[PDB]
């Protein structure tokens, strides 16, 4: 829907704070954290999957956080 596409990054950010500047900044972060706390099995599954697919000790955590944030 329209709410799925926000108005972030459009380059029109000025000194004055924009609409939903207090709660909209950490909205996605807090919703992802709550989705993690509500679903730990998927988080550990993605963690072990990224650990088995990375084999470099760095891209494992990157792929894990990417798979965790990409799922709304």
């Amino acid at each position: 829907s329209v709410a799925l596409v926000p108005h972030v990054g459009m380059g029109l950010e000025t000194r004055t704070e924009t609409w939903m500047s207090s709660e909209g900044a950490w909205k996605h972060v807090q919703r992802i954290e709550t989705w993690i706390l509500r679903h730990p099995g998927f988080t550990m599954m993605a963690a072990i999957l990224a650990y088995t697919i990375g084999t470099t000790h760095f891209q494992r955590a990157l792929i894990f956080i990417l798979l965790t944030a990409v799922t709304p």
Binding site: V2, A3, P6, E13, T16, T18
Partner: peptide, 23 residues
Amino acid sequence: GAMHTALTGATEIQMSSGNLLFT
């Protein structure tokens, strides 16, 4: 409400009788 949560990057201005940009 979906529009309001879709405007997290847009700057709020005043449009009642004249277009007043405050940004």
